[model samples]
Target: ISPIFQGGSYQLNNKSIDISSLLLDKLSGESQTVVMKFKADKPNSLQALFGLSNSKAGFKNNYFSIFMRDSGEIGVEIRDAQKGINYLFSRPASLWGKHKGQAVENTLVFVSDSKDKTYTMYVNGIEVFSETVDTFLPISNINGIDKATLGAVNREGKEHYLAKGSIDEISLFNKAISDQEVSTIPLSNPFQLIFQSGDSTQANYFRIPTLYTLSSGRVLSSIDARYGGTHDSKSKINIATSYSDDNGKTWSEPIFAMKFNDYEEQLVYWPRDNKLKNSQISGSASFIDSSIVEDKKSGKTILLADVMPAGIGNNNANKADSGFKEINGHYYLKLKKNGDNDFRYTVRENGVVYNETTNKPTNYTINDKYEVLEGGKSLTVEQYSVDFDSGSLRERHNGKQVPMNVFYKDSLFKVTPTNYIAMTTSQNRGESWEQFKLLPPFLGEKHNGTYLCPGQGLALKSSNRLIFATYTSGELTYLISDDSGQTWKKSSASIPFKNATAEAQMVELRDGVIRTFFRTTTGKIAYMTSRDSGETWSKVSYIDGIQQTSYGTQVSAIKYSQLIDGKEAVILSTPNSRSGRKGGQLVVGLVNKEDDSIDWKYHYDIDLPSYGYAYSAITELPNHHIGVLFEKYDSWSRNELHLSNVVQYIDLEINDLT
Candidate 1:
């Protein structure tokens, strides 16, 4: 797809770019193709876009210009200095004249062929003008046209007929291209493919992007690699991780940070409808929604993800079970043998399996690699591998066999069907991750399962504590950690609404003042504050400028490293729409220390309402650029069949927002 210059283009105030090199000067034989993107400052006025003329000879001598009339008509003027003749071809405009001041992405393309003596014009991919002229303007017959200028006519040495709007990209072709070729041209979106689905990672769908910048200036990104479509229920998903050492200019190939072996990682279409029993993989262990935090105290990059057991999702999970049981005084991972429904075994110290009924050690032992060993002999099993395109089972024996976790249904032992949180630590940046360990039963005995919303985890500035805005039950709360994530407790910060699921991103405004931007089902981007390092919260409030949908989308925010307006600033990314997930934008908020209120100062739109924009994560790069990784599709309305390039990344300077 060719790049379309759309969002993020700078405003042109009576300015035109010098496209002397980007566009060709000579045409190919009797055919020529021109494509450019423009936005006029005002309609119902004359404006010149492209001009190749010699001003000394006047407008009618040896000149070629594309202009618009006061009546909103598009015109083209061509003059041959040799023939001393001029041709005027024009067409009236309708769609381009409706708006007052705020213009459009107005993509224009023109293809002229002297073989048929016809020239056709297109606006925003639709044919609006076509003319069969007796004598078409050919660049071969014109002379002394050495250079071309945009937004104005460069009459030899003078620049005039300036358009008071912005124009960025211009693509000129030598021949009369096909409609298929014109269709391949892409509109310029500010974002590009970051972690594309079905890339070298071999995943069918990628969702829930979480990005963070390490202290070493390494930008680490994580996503849910949904191998079995983008469905959340009963599908194979893994947590994939990649890092960009170049401030998000590029990222390394993604590797699975957490995965399950019960099902092969292959692209499987998750049907849109509720039918297709085969699409329901009841017992595939999956991991989703990762949250990353770097503990300054321990220098450990702690990554947490929601681990769902086979046949269990959030809606149907065992609310009280943390996938572990207390035998005597020690908490053990409960396991059930292949033939029994009841869990009669517990994993004890040093990979030894203990029979809870007999209180004795069993012959089977589970290794850290999750391989089952019996009487000092390793068990042999075929590893699951799927064919790339066919999505078929392609298992092979006598290969590099990977151990299976007892949590898997195919193993001799299985965990109870429920959801749990798994934590992994990276000591050396994010180059590698340690083995993931299930968190202990933190909330007493039977408690609501927990998972951090996909975003950055908060390490408080006032104290050496880690706070993550997490989802428990179906509501929002803070998962407070006092010892660098070694021990965690649920905070008193609670949402007072009836059924609140505030998936928020937290940022520390000052020493003891922490703020959170959250989602509300009432079609507003609401927020709250924690005065004592996330121990408690304040009343919920809505932001004035940002917009939201009833079925709210995930939002990401980070405190800007530098001060703005002589106070702390925060940068957030969200889909600002009252109706659906669209018009995704970045908003900068200026903090007021006196009242703890925020003035939403600036907003930079990332995509238009016609495209889908949903969950997003923002972080400040080492180069002081704002880096965002977001879902570039309409998550609120897309069908279940998988699509690629759903996750995109873009970096912008603070100037772009201010």
Candidate 2:
């Protein structure tokens, strides 16, 4: 369907950026400004569709736009990205009359100024919503903007409610424009781009590169796949790779990478029958032993690596578990015993280093003359290379320093245990772990979500600044760490919903705002923010466009290390059951915004598959590239959901979409 232009420069009634990026595979969070102009030509009850998200439940999250009500009221519809909820705001008791069709060229803009926490809504040239309370959402990443329509949103069953007026132009920027500037009515600004649709399932992540900075002090960014697994003959969870080296401005081809088992055992690749189902035979799941550590003594980093069999229970629990060692000072998941599988509860086992090239544990030797600062416990290479493009790093049998996590800035790390959202820590770098159990009881005492996955790990940021996010029987909950990872306290607040899953990520925002991104059993990617460090949080608000009932939503905040193109940004990802018109989507992008943590300014949705994707985790790599590990399935089913674990690479850039 081609866009239909209205009035002079108005293009109304169409999907934003038709067939663009999918819901989960986009690069977003750039500083951009979005503005729209329309008017009620004839004074009738006027409504202009500002943005209509891909429907999730019975209907999509549609921000039913408003200039002035027939009864002299000012109204605006707020739809969250997850499509779990919608809010309607209207001026109190104001009887607004239809201003004849002559006012078609008028303008209305919803602006989130990064300079403050206020959302400036401009009517023609006047600010209407001056610091509204519902201004909880930010406008950093604005989706549903391209090829906008005038009149009302196109409804399937209803008639009449359409705007009986005309519109002139719609413009967007990376910054907010005030009333005085909007009302100036300068020269002619026409619609810059037109959009059309053919319904192809290939999702495109619209990323604006050169906008984000990284903690590693690097500018290069790409999509990295962390961990994934597949089930037996009953199911196949094949997670692959795809990325872009540029600064999220573009992406590279997707390379089919490794696979995991039904239980998320990362290190091994289980053998399967021709049907792609597991043959009930045990094999290596590549990412079996994975752990996140923050050196309490030092901020230096390492990722503990190991290999395990593709089985239901712990791979090393029954065996000696002495199959692997550390890479570049990084320890294996089996901690405490060198090749001894005595303590089976630790993230990994600590052991000696071995050079597979020489087929022997090399002497405590230095491969490269890098910085081994902070008491010589670890090594740091300034000019390190990360081949996230292929399995070279994973297949690194060479004795050279394999990347490892051996240090911690404040003693913190997070992970899921058997049916509980627990937190553990190690005072020593990747040396030991202490588990603190504080997860809510299961949803039902009877046969509830038994086969349901266990609780995800906890996350920490500065010592005494810890947070954990998880869902039991699909209910969301959070726990905070006040004494590093030693002790934890759970929050009394939680979003109201039944059967939801919040086990993806616990991300920290600037200025002590701790947030966790998760999806519900009903298929919504919702997150809650804690204004008081990790203590409390506001209700979970739905992000616009995501399905109400979905597989799950994976979200993370992308922080920029540099000022690219004069905009600070964050990248968010999720699965869209409503986007791309058909199957699941990998939506990623700079969900840029002002102070409001609820709304967004710019959003890029990237499609991943025609089916569905869920159970995802995203992490920033050494080279500033981003990696996402998750599960993919044909449909949204618990059985299939358990079998959809996959790790795929994606380097989504912003320049490619806009």
Candidate 3:
């Protein structure tokens, strides 16, 4: 009892201890017990704890082994010839009062009795299961039972299924152990949990984690705080924030980095119908799809997000409208009264809206809360709020049939044209945020029936410019700012692509040129090059060798480090599943200056196939460790949305990607 066993202890670090030389005769015949006490790192994948098999090493052909699954469940598997049988038994980590990503100590015991044709399994002095087999095959019947392994087994010539942590003690008994004996054995080791859903805040679910390391060495993370479950649209979602001052060892509580007005203030056309008045509406404003950038000169952080009006989504027609029309190269906000096809317009020359037809400044004003005002009075209109289906389709608000008001639909409804862009700045290194700045559809660019969505913004390293990408009528375009995002200009030159909904990012290359990568409907990652500081871009081309799902997903690519060849390399994070938004992998590729191509040399696994993975953001930590925040659950096709387990993060080394 002093040393736990007479044979002392052995340690295993992913390598197995070959016990075949011991030649334990009891394992070949009637009854035997195998016991192991070890501390296990959180399982990253299925691992073999101890095994005896006909094969030299692997879990193939015929074998008897104990395994720990990635989900933290433990089991015993026994195979005969080509087919095998597995007995899975374990409780959730919560039942053991453990969170995810936590390591724990475990005592695993297996007692097999060929005479009774039964096997019993125990974990931590608790009986998990006991089973009897129909066709009991003795271990002696196994072919080529020349070796037994402790930590890892073999199949063919390759060795895998290795245990993650260290194995402290192991004992071999010639006779089956009694239940009372197993209960007397101590089987307890505590582990620590790092990140879990609903651990830090009250929000039902969090998704789309974006991480950025500022120049001050502070780690900034933002996520989507979905309240009404994890529904994407038609719900109240806010962007939440958290920061860590001491690397990633600890983090602050969830804070509201960017949020929308209360649900009642968010007005949207709910049910569009002839029976319901145009004033009928509902409240469901949301701010989603966040991207962050840090200014190098000022250390100010800029947060960009899509501001959705109630009842409208990204693909809606309202988002593409400028709300302003251009005549003779001048821009004017288009406005029309009810029942009038011909429209009157207002123009903003110098931050003032003017009557276009009269060429006089209009008296209309908007408050900080975005409430339109006329003559010092709050402008109110009858907009469609809720819908009902009785006989024919109709809409009503407050249980009354309100007459239609075309004025509200044409001029007042937020959902008529499209979603708008909103920005918030943090001068104090993401400690606090300024007021939301609402930019019109044509934010320095003339809107030509096209709306632009924001991707991860870029702080150019070579110049004093801040740039980002947006799709204009399905062509990739960029927004450039010379004054640290004070006044921005849009490029007229666009990437040559027609059937693309490009949400992309820009990365500075070793040369003066910049490369923009984006998602396209062409079932591949599309890219283009820009020279002279994003003024013009080259023709669009697809990234070869990287096959994605049919309708490609958004990706995050940034300059990682220098290669030995003196060329700059980049790390790309995105879902690489051929079917859908799963199987997320990170690619570390070199920039081919000769042909403007990418040599994706190193591919690393980020999320396993079983878990859902979507949008991701990567940042380089203090010591070159890569940090990733990603959507861990698929909100696209899954109906069980926003169950609180949505997003996660992991820190990886440079070699992890290679």
TM for every model, in the order presented, reads 0.70, 0.37, 0.62
- Give the per-residue lDDT of model 3 (tens digit) for 1-658: 1221223255666777777666434354456677777666444477887777666545366666777665444676666654454433332111121213243456778787777887887765545456677766554345565557777765554455887665677776666767787767776633111233444544545666677788888988877776544556455677777887877667777666666533322222222122432222224566777778888777688887766665555555353365556666555445544454545545354334455567776676444444455655666544333333454323333432222221123234122334656678888877788766655444433343333333367777777887766666546656677776776667754655665667787787754578888888777888788777787788777887676677777788878755624656888888776776766778888878787567888777663444456777788888778877776545454332333343556667776576
Per-residue accuracy of model 2 over 216-307 as CA lDDT, tens digit each = 33222112122222332111222222333443333434322223322221333322223432233232222221224343334322122122
Whole-model lDDT, model 1 = 0.71
Q: What is each predicted model's overall lDDT from 0 to 1?
A: 0.71, 0.35, 0.60
* Model 3 ranges with Cα > 4 A deviation: 1-201, 264-282, 325-364, 372-417, 443-455, 492-499, 561-567, 592-597
lDDT of 1 by residue, 528-574 (tens): 88788877788778887777878899999999999877878998899
In model 1, which range of ten residues has the least summed lDDT?
A: 93-102
* Weakest 10 consecutive residues of candidate 2 by summed lDDT: 190-199
Question: Distance from true position, residue 326, model 2, in Å?
Answer: 36
Task: Give the CA lDDT, 0 to 100, for residue 639 in model 2.
Answer: 26
Q: lDDT of candidate 3? A: 0.60
